[PDB]
Ligand SMILES: NS(=O)(=O)c1c(F)c(F)c(N[C@]23C[C@H]4C[C@H](C[C@H](C4)C2)C3)c(F)c1F
């Protein structure tokens with residue numbers, strides 16, 4: 001039922017998922033000026049050398065590129081984190097126009113898109129158990145602006161025509177997610193939630209300060225995807241972002257400056 005239109009969009013979610021109005025919801029605006037520098041935060045450790053991509057799926061809200069998370073193959077650790085978190089999937093949120101699309105904002109600025117690399121805490125044994133814990137997930141957010149092409153994203157953009165409608169999937173092996181990372185790993189971090197229903201408050205958010213650049217043609221291709229299934233009327237998959245939620249009683253920490 002939930003989605004991103006007039007009648008079922010983010011402002012409606014709280015009726016099915018009352019946690020929508022809770023104490024640690026995501027995304028948020030990152031006020032760069034009041035984020036607290038913390039010299040005790042560690043560098044983020046991104047170990048994606050052994051990543052195994054498997055498949056790409058249109059799930060009706062975004063597309064996910066999924067990874068084999070049955071061993072420690074692509075993990076995030078360090079940064080603000082105490083455990084090891086295995087990469088299970090990545091996906092993006094984007095706009096109908098280049099002026100919007102990101103979920104997090106930086107001093108109210110919206111980016112054309114936002115990449116989410118979703119990871120789960122190995123201590124809880126799998127993803128479904130991890131989302132029930134307050135430290136279950138670590139999601140690495142990376143902003144996308146439009147400019148030069150990101151060569152490392154092109155394999156993804158090139159397969160989207162094969163998964164146009166909700167429910168379609170395609171084999172997607174040997175995709176290297178290191179080709180989506182900007183140069184710097186400087187980050188902000190705060191405690192928050194999944195940004196889609198069920199909106200579970202299980203996420204340590206780690207948002208990179210440095211955006212990656214993607215070409216207008218790349219992001220144009222995201223916008224050719226569909227929310228609807230193959231049988232049905234065409235609703236373009238655009239503006240699948242939740243806007244910024246109240247920070248409430250939370251402090252955003254910065255690994256830098
Ligand atoms: N935007 S996000 O990074 O906060 C995010 C996830 F982290 C996610 F893990 C997911 N995936 C799930 C898969 C399934 C279990 C939960 C709830 C639903 C169904 C969405 C998480 C998701 F859709 C999502 F948008």
Ligand SMILES: [Zn+2]
Nearest residue numbers: 091093116195
């Ligand atoms: Zn997301």
